[model samples]
Target: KVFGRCELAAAMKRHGLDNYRGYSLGNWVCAAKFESNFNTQATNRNTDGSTDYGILQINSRWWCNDGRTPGSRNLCNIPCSALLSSDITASVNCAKKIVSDGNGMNAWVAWRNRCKGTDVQAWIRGCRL
Candidate 1:
């Protein structure tokens, strides 16, 4: 709820993620759209009893803790709630860790299905970034 599309672009760029880990800002934006629609409070449960959290929808199985599970790998070493804040810095940071370990955003099914090879340029159009 903190940012509109343009504002998100600006903020993401401000975080120096316009080009991070071989991903463009457009890839981040497009993936965010499918992941959480840019909603910071977003959460979803998986059939495997794992949950995803925050704007980037990072999973409790790998990145953050959702309290539903006590033993998480927690590679980001963050509580999932931390990523649900209106400020997106922590979420962005976790996303970087994810990409560094995986095939960029390819680990995210949302990115693979919704953003991969799509015309993602529209995500950052006309923001002057």
Candidate 2:
């Protein structure tokens, strides 16, 4: 939770997320804005009894291990709890893998519904990077 929007954008770019899946830094930054306000400790209980994890809200139902969610593919090979940390190395790498799985930014509902087709450049504007 130590990041301002600009700092978060810079972090993602440093992790190569800006080039991952060919999506711009602003696009992922916008998704992170809606998903968790850049808080790594973010979590959400979905209506379907599943949960979302970390800043991008990667779903426990598909991407990470959830002790009570029986159907997880754990595609990231990481625990949901591991995502709730500021280190972000594992989470960012796993997020890139999720994007590479052909879902692109569509893996995040926030991106699909809020970032897609929108001019999300404001997410990174004035960062001066």
Candidate 3:
């Protein structure tokens, strides 16, 4: 299933992502689809033995640091699951922060380019929001 219309819209507002980057939610969907297929429970195995968990494939080791259980930290600090659980409006917000703080989408863009290997911008043209 796709993201909720109003919920995604609100997410755009919360983050400062450009809602008009594309004609519709296709941009956001493209990112989500590539990132985690919109699956909140998705997780990827890192070569370092660490795990990137939840939607958005957030690395648990980086964001979850409340001294809570291994996987009990708030999902808001996570990525994909945060978008789906605590606040859909904040998912992209967190992503923007992480992107800006880390690589400013260059990493994501590079990865997308590697995956599609062409017209990488096309996949994320409307992903801001």
Candidate 4:
């Protein structure tokens, strides 16, 4: 399922992405905009053969097991397929651990290029949360 902006924001807020590890809700909203445009089943195969899955684009190489990545760590201990659900609990939980890594939110290049250091309030404007 695809989410409207505020719909996604509200869902993320409920899942505790707001103020998670020092990143704001808007940061996550912004990343979602660029990463997958709120499409629950989004997937992007990296040139290196690892695939990114779901709204937050959790990667198969290190975060989840896709059975295709050469040396997947499965750090999130989840099936990559789980990230595609409209019910974003697993996606949010995986992302929570991802941000705790050294990269923080910058782990997603989309976030670094688009959401970093900007006033992301625009992403969450009018979202009552």
Candidate 5:
């Protein structure tokens, strides 16, 4: 029943530190941090000639079509605020899809192995479901 920006942020902040299987919560937090710094409304315009948006740093132009409409190729086109504002699990699931497709928690395993421990659980206290 978690909803709203603050509530979702709290939920994300908590679950974002949960380790699944061999993947520590810190790994996913690293990804999210690197991607969007846990900002549900985060957006970035890469000077390298790419644009990204949202908590997952999804490219609005490429993923959601620049908000032309819902489900467009641009990242913001899907109304991420709705996802971020309505459901915490859904938002996390969306991030998982971008990071790992449908592999679920196993995605973190591959990321940890492939990334060579670049994503380690950091100092996170009281961050649990």
Candidate 6:
């Protein structure tokens, strides 16, 4: 499922992405914009053979267990496929763990390259929280 910009922001807010670990909800939305463009089934394979899954592009290398990333920690304790669902509950929950594990929003390179240190609030400015 693909989400509208405001729709995604509202969803993230409902899942507690707002001010999660000092990063505002817009930060998450901004990163998601570049990571997967709000597409729930987005996936990318890394050069190291690890795969990123779902809207946030959660990686199999350390977050989810795709059963093929070779020695994956599977720290999220969930099948990477869970992240691809349109519900987004699993994806948001796992992303929380990713931030709590000290990676912050930097876990997604899109955040670093596009959203980092920028006024991300613009991403959701016109949307109702």
Q: Is candidate 2 or candidate 6 better by TM-score?
A: 6
Clashes of each: 0, 0, 1, 0, 10, 0
lDDT (CA) per prediction: 0.85, 0.85, 0.49, 0.93, 0.48, 0.91
Query: Which is the better candidate, 2 or 4, if ranked by lDDT?
Result: 4
Candidate 6, residues 1-129, lDDT tens digits: the string is 999999999999998889989888889999999999999999999999999999999989888888888877888899999999989999999989988876677778999999998999899998977
Q: What TM-score quantifies how close candidate 1 is to the native fold?
A: 0.93
Candidate 6 vs. true structure, TM-score: 0.96
What candidate 6 gets wrong by more than 4 Å, as runs, is none
Instruction: Report the number of the highest-TM-score candidate.
Output: 4
Per-residue lDDT of candidate 5, residues 39-125 (tens digit): 666656655445554555554444444443334353323554444343445456555445554454443333345433552544233
Off by over 4 Å in 3: 1-15, 19-28, 66-86, 109-111, 114-129
- In candidate 2, what are the lDDT values of residues 1-129, reduced to their tens digit? 747899898888888888576788999889888988888999899887789888888888888887988766788888899988887887898888888887688878878998899998888999977
Give me the runs in candidate 2 sitting further than 4 Å from their true place: none
* Tens digits of per-residue lDDT for model 1, 27-116: 898888888988989889988889988888889987886678756688899988999899999988888888898587888898899899
Higher-lDDT candidate of 1 and 5 = 1
Cα distance off (Å), candidate 4, residue 49: 0.9
On lDDT, the leading prediction is 4
Global local distance difference test of model 5? 0.48
* Candidate 4 error regions (>4 Å): none
Q: Given candidate 1, what's the lDDT at residue 86?
A: 90
**Residue 29, model 4, lDDT:** 92
The TM-score that candidate 2 achieves is 0.92
Candidate 6 lDDT score at position 15: 84
CA RMSD per model (angstroms): 1.3, 1.3, 6.2, 0.8, 6.7, 0.9
